[PDB]
Amino acid sequence: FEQIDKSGSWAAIYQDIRHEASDFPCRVAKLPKNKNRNRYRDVSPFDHSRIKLHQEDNDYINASLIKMEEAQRSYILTQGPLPNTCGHFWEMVWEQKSRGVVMLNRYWPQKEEKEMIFEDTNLKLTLISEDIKSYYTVRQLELENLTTQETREILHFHYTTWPDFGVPPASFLNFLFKVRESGSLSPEHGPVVVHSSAGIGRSGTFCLADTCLLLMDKRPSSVDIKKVLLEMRKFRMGLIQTADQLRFSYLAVIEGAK
């Protein structure tokens, strides 16, 4: 609740969070078979929290499960889909019983008239409805695992304008809340899939805000934004890519309190 802020030490905190951030083994992402299932050579899932694809040949996709015990909120953070990936993306989404998708990074159907099919993973994707607001756009989507012939609906929230290492303060929250209100975050359903370009900077900022906002409800002013992020950064390396972004989560959360 206190501005650092005249001190100007915002980077010093980031350097601490970056430095004191635990690093874990990444054996499986590293494998020559999995060289091209990664978009980014530097960003990779921790071997312990990674999502495993059910398809027997290769169970690897670049996603990591965040579980936050106390807050009760679980997210799945993944790089955006590559050409290869699109099938895997929806595979996981279907495997983890997810009922919400969060794109913050400027693989779905543009027209209702035209369905989408992935031979690779044997899933279909049809648009159902669309909603454009200026800040963010929402689609109502339908997934059928063709083999099952069982259809389960999915909600896609696209934060249209978040710069690659940029923010994000009101629109962010409206958007966060919109996602909350839809019930995609609710624990009845599997994890909400959150994806930035590699699923760290924007993803972290997004998930950071929402979790801490949950803490104030549950707990009062006890919460520390660090400690939570360090803890969060245990499941997926490199969450929050800038000091400006960190400051922003701190900020959003403060504003979100009211």
Partner: peptide
């Protein structure tokens, strides 16, 4: 194969 980072 690019790096997101910096």
């Amino acid at each position: 194969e690019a790096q997101y980072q910096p």
